[PDB]
Amino acid sequence: GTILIDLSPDDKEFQSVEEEMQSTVREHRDGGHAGGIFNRYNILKIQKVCNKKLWERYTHRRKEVSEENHNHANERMLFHGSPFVNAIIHKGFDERHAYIGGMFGAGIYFAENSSKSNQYVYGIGGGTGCPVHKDRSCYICHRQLLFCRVTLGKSFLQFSA
Amino acid sequence: MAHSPPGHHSVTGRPSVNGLALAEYVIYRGEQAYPEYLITYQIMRPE
Ligand SMILES: CN(C)c1ccc(-c2cc(=O)c3ccccc3o2)cc1
Numbered sequence: 206g207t208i209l210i211d212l213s214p215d216d217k218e219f220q221s222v223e224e225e226m227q228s229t230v231r232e233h234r235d236g237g238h239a240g241g242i243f244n245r246y247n248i249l250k251i252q253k254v255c256n257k258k259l260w261e262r263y264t265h266r267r268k269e270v271s272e273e274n275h276n277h278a279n280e281r282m283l284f285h286g287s288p289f290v291n292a293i294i295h296k297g298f299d300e301r302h303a304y305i306g307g308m309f310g311a312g313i314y315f316a317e318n319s320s321k322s323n324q325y326v327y328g329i330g331g332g333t334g335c336p337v338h339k340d341r342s343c344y345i346c347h348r349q350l351l352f353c354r355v356t357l358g359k360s361f362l363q364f365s366a
Numbered sequence: 367m368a369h370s371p372p373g374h375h376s377v378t379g380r381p382s383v384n385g386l387a388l389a390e391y392v393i394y395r396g397e398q399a400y401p402e403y404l405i406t407y408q409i410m411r412p413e
């Protein structure tokens with residue numbers, strides 16, 4: 206039930222999504238090991254993901270959370286990078302998309318920094334890099350990130366290195 | 367998947383060393399996120 210709608214670069218919605226991508230790039234403490242060396246991206250395409258069943262599943266849970274947190278879903282827009290982006294856009298997030306060894310336990314992880322989610326596009330730690338060249342810093346191969354609507358509700362604050 | 371800490375719906379990982387890092391977040395139910403935009407890109411080689 207998923208359809209993908211291309212956004213024009215002239216569309217304000219394309220432009221605001223691109224700006225969030227580009228403006229949340231930072232340097233990483235691995236010197237680019239996982240995600241590559243770069244300060245900015247070449248955006249090739251931005252598509253809106255439209256799936257009624259997945260949307261309704263999201264809004265149902267959002268209302269439950271909201272009602273448990275003084276009518277506040279604490280909804281954010283956050284990046285997610287994964288080898289399974291194609292499964293996610295068709296079937297939704299589930300336990301198969303979790304970072305079992307993540308520092309905050311086995312859950313599904315998102316980042317404010319697009320460059321942080323970029324480190325996971327080819328796997329944990331960048332895996333072996335792109336499938337074609339085995340390069341975590343490949344400048345040729347096309348990468349994909351999701352920019353996601355996320356309900357945080359009441360969020361446990363972990364101060365961490 | 368693990369469970370959220372009791373009384374919570376997510377975890378926020380607040381950076382405590384790297385002054386320039388933004389937050390990272392964890393949810394424990396797939397239904398708490400919707401993949402709204404698919405962004406296809408390349409990283410660019412610095413000049
Ligand atoms: C083992 N699998 C399926 C994954 C998938 C995605 C991630 C992932 C994806 C993210 O975008 C992310 C962002 C901040 C911190 C960790 C992050 O981890 C990790 C493991």
Ligand SMILES: [Zn+2]
Nearest residue numbers: 335338343346
């Ligand atoms: Zn490549």
